[model samples]
Target: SMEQVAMELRLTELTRLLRSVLDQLQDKDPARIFAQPVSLKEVPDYLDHIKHPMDFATMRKRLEAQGYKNLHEFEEDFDLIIDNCMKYNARDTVFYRAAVRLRDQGGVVLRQARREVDSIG
Candidate 1:
């Protein structure tokens, strides 16, 4: 419930921002604007840890250790794919989901940053 509430709030703010941007670009086609690709400066060294299968019990234990108090708290820190990889294999669906979430978050942050810069100019 908490995660849903937080997501709803975030979505509301994002929607407002998007509308404002749309209004600013009303005379221009938004499709003509291209987003710059994100660059990775460095690749971190990998650790040879085996992926274990994840179950509710394992998920709960991991969250408990991290001081997560409830399902919402758990969801707040969740990347379905990464958590799945930790419990299972790197090739799992959860891992891909985590990657997608990361990509989406990065794009959102970049867009917000660009908007802030534009506002100051």
Candidate 2:
């Protein structure tokens, strides 16, 4: 089971990198709005607008469950958080601006991690 062993080993490194990515995202999110799922009570029409919602808490939960297969899966999910915000919020709103920053900064961490993983082998 060399392939199985190799993937298990790879998962360890992936977990570490993904955790750091989440940490950086949490640190940057000041209001902590993206820390968890958006409340229906606060924004009743949220679900009406956003078909797919994502947050750091869910990402962490998925990471714990070993839901992500590799760096690209993690990265795609990470980007979706921003994409959802960008899709829902108005251009003049602060939420849109926050998404912009996260997209920029968050993208760097994911890209760096990809290189790190590629360089590993």
Candidate 3:
């Protein structure tokens, strides 16, 4: 009964976001999303769009290896990407583009992150 209720709660509350995530990603090419111009207004939206690839552990391991100790630090680098996207897309569609990088490791996405992704009702 508990598991059934739990499943019901999850479906009731979370499918909107997962459906939203899936519907947008349906036919979109990764290359296109990667290169699409991100305005300041769309920066957060863009990040959520590909929230799945945000490899936390490996990327964090790499970042920590390089001296970053906080999410804010990586967020800083990502902020740079968003800022660059907005600035570059403003007037020119240059060859170079700002892309968000997520940290992951060991071929296993951090367990917690993977759970949310898998539990799409």
Which has the greatest TM-score? 2
Question: Where does candidate 1 stray beyond 4 Å?
Answer: 29-121
Q: Worst 10-residue stretch by lDDT in candidate 1? A: 31-40
lDDT, each prediction: 0.39, 0.83, 0.38
User: What lDDT, from 0 to 1, does candidate 2 have?
Assistant: 0.83
Score every model by TM-score.
0.26, 0.89, 0.28
Per-residue lDDT for 1-121 in model 3, tens only?
8998877565545434333332333223244443333443745665544332322233334442444433244445434434444444443443133132211221132243236545643
lDDT by residue (tens digit), candidate 2, 52-112? 8898989999998778878888877788888999899889999999989877877677678
The residue pairs that clash in candidate 1, if any, are 52-87, 52-88, 53-87, 81-94, 81-95
- Models, CA RMSD each: 15.3, 1.6, 14.4
CA displacement after TM-score superposition, residue 2 of candidate 1 (Å): 1.5
The weakest ten consecutive residues by lDDT in model 3 span 98-107
Candidates 2 and 3, the one with greater lDDT: 2
Give the lDDT of residue 62 in candidate 1: 52
lDDT score, candidate 3, position 115: 62
In candidate 3 the C-alpha lDDT for residue 2 amounts to 100
